[PDB]
């Protein structure tokens, strides 16, 4: 289930739902469910949502387990940084202003790779300035 | 409880950072960026992984929170069976021909709803057979 179409396929394969029944319910036709299913093909966003449906799933919990493969993107923050900001329980009281100050910083590119570096980094910048 | 592109919205603004930030680091316009921020056009798979990597964050982990509005779709299976099935530590060996099985099983157009009765009748089911 790791890819998107396995996924897909596994949601109906344990559910021991014809082809047809998913694609009746649906309102698609079965070769365009197959080709979904065998990746050949990528399904839009709102037909996520009515496959989700189907299977009386969310798209959040049917994108669950699955990986996107593709290319990559570097992120636009470090990911310590990021991860810090991604974190509700660390990091929660930064303002957006420091989380835009401290993207700045980078030495000699390299960067510490901890959320919890990023944190005190902002307590002790925080200190001295503001 | 929250719109996609409200999402993505609150992403970039948690942040601080500038549509150019994000754009230039996902590598699509700024113009589209803003659409897709404004909801008045809907990201592609593709694109919303890109987005996803410019935040160091998966897609699952970006959609996280998110409502669609879009479908109307009613379920394959009873909500109660669905239900069942969807949860990973209640009934995790049932095979999918006992659920094909479960699922003919309404009464007067009516089911129970409920995921634990589902489970019941399936042991009892079982154990009959
Ligand atoms: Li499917
Ligand atoms: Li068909
Ligand atoms: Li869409
Ligand atoms: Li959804
Ligand atoms: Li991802």
């Given at each position: 289930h790791m890819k998107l179409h396995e996924r897909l396929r596994?949601?109906?394969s344990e559910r021991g739902l014809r082809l047809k029944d998913v694609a009746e319910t649906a309102g698609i036709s079965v070769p365009y469910?197959?080709?979904?299913?065998?990746?050949?093909?990528n399904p839009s966003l709102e037909t996520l949502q009515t496959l989700a449906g189907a299977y009386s799933i969310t798209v959040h919990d049917l994108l669950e387990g699955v990986e996107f493969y593709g290319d990559s993107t570097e992120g636009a923050l470090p990911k310590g940084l990021a991860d810090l900001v991604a974190d509700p329980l660390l990091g929660s009281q930064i303002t957006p202003d420091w989380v835009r100050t401290l993207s700045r910083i980078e030495l000699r590119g390299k960067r510490p790779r901890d959320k919890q570096?990023?944190?005190?980094?902002?307590?002790?910048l925080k200190r001295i300035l503001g």
């Open positions: 596994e949601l109906r469910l197959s080709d979904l299913e065998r990746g050949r093909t570096d990023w944190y005190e980094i902002y307590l002790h």
